[PDB]
């Protein structure tokens, strides 16, 4: 029956698209981390302008709460409920850790070093102001993403049996 | 059924890249709301004006991620031209940001100039990047409709 398969595909694709939106929000924070202590140069490269990171981190913070918000609305019956919940828990822990470090992350003149302990994956100087939570959230959304992609693959495969 | 199987497969992948590019644009909208702001103990944003240079560098590096995602999107006939158009718009957006480095790449980037670069519908003007951002957003909307329409005609 082609109709049953047609709905299976559209529903699997819709869940994948919803998950990939959250993972792209996460990937944008990785892009923000590249800009810590940087300014745009005339030639398109980045140059140093150190320790003015507060509004960059403020942007990273509201993206992180947008991640939690979008994950809170995903409740289908497909079977990803436990992977979704694990990602939402990680997203809350990341936002709470940022907010909890406002004395270094929410002042005029936030330093490069403190910003990197918040959003730079694999930061060498430490991970105590958000990075550990960011890495876990990243892995949690990536697991979910691969899982929803494999569901879409198996639904599209049913077209030919 | 053969025709439809390809159209589903080709439209899904384009939809995938587009929705992830649109999420990157939503991240730039969050950056725009954070202009001149800092984090507070309760999660709200408080005012701390005119230090937007790394925020703008962050928007800029996102804009190059958008272009790279669009440049490797290698789609089917009937979507290829809308892909190429979106790629061109994303390039014009990054170019306009860098061309305005005299206001956007200095120590102490002002709230006013940051808003003319990344805040959609900024009241004082759109002359440092917003016009290109609005055009890129419209170009992605055209592409999204065309690819989602192929999936619909495919469910026939």
> For chain B, which residues make up each domain, given as ranges?
1-156
In the block, tokens 């199987």 appear at B5
Helix (H) or strand (E) holding A153: helix A131-157
Q: Which of B106, B48, B68 is nearest to A59 (CA)?
A: B48
Residue ranges of B 76-135 with Cβ closer than 8 A to chain A: 94, 97-98, 101, 104-107, 109
Shortest CA gap B81–chain A (Å):
23
Read off the DSSP letter of residue B39. Answer: E
Strands B37-39 and A46-48 turn out to be unpaired
- In DSSP notation, A6-57 reads HHHHHHHHHHHHHHHHHHHHHHHHHHHHHTTTEEE-TTSSEEE--S--HHHH
**CB contact at 8 A, A40 and B60:** yes
Chain B residues close to A17, C-beta within 8 Å: 15-16, 19
Q: Which of A69, A68, A70, A63 is nearest to A88 (CA)?
A: A68
Say how far apart CA A69 and CA A143 lie, in whole Å.
19
Technique employed here was X-ray
The packing angle between helices B130-155 and B80-99, to 10°, is 160
Q: Give this entry's resolution in angstroms.
A: 1.9
**CB contact at 8 A, A119 and A131:** yes
Contact check, Cβ <8 Å, B98/A42: yes
Q: Which of B51, B46, B45, B31 is nearest to B117 (CA)?
A: B31
- In DSSP notation, B13-29 reads HHHHHHHHHHHHHHHHH
Burial (0-12, 13-18, 19+ Cβ within 10 Å), B36: buried
**CB contact at 8 A, A117 and A125:** yes
Say how far apart CA B133 and CA B119 lie, in whole Å.
9
Say how far apart CA B104 and CA A44 lie, in whole Å.
12
Say how far apart CA B67 and CA A86 lie, in whole Å.
31
Name residue B38's beta-bridge partners. Answer: B46
Shortest CA gap A131–chain B (Å):
17
Structure token digits, residue A153: 């693959």
Alpha helices in chain B (DSSP H): 2-33, 53-71, 80-99, 101-104, 111-118, 130-155
Q: Which of A63, A61, A85 is nearest to A73 (CA)?
A: A85
Say how far apart CA B146 and CA B1 lie, in whole Å.
20
**CB contact at 8 A, B59 and A28:** no
Touching check for B68 and chain A: CB below 8 Å? no
For residue A150, the tally of other CB atoms under 10 A from its CB is: 12
Say how far apart CA A146 and CA A150 lie, in whole Å.
6
- In DSSP notation, A86-141 reads HHHHHHHHHHHHHHHTHHHHSSTT--HHHHHHHH-TT-TT--TTTHHHHHHHHHHH
Q: Which of A49, A67, A54, A63 is nearest to A115 (CA)?
A: A54
User: Computed over its alpha carbons, how large is the radius of gyration of chain A?
Assistant: 19
**CB contact at 8 A, A137 and A87:** yes
Shortest CA gap B79–chain A (Å):
19
Residue A20 makes CB contacts below 8 A (sequence gap 6+) with: A145, A148, B16, B19, B20, B23
């Amino acid at each position: 029956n082609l109709t049953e398969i047609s709905k299976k595909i559209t529903d699997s694709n819709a869940v994948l698209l919803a998950v990939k939106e959250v993972e792209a929000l996460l990937s944008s924070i990785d892009e923000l981390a590249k800009a810590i202590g940087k300014k745009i140069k005339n030639d398109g490269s980045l140059g140093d302008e150190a320790n003015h990171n507060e509004s960059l981190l403020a942007g990273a913070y509201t993206i992180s709460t947008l991640i939690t918000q979008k994950l809170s609305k995903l409740n289908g019956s497909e079977g990803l409920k436990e992977k979704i919940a694990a990602a939402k828990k990680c997203s809350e822990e990341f936002s709470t850790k940022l907010k909890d470090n406002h004395a270094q992350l929410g002042i005029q003149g936030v330093t490069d070093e403190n910003a990197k302990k918040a959003i730079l994956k694999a930061n060498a100087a430490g991970k105590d102001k958000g990075v550990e939570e960011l890495e876990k959230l990243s892995g949690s959304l990536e697991s979910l993403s691969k899982a929803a992609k494999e569901m879409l693959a198996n639904s599209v495969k049913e077209l030919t049996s």
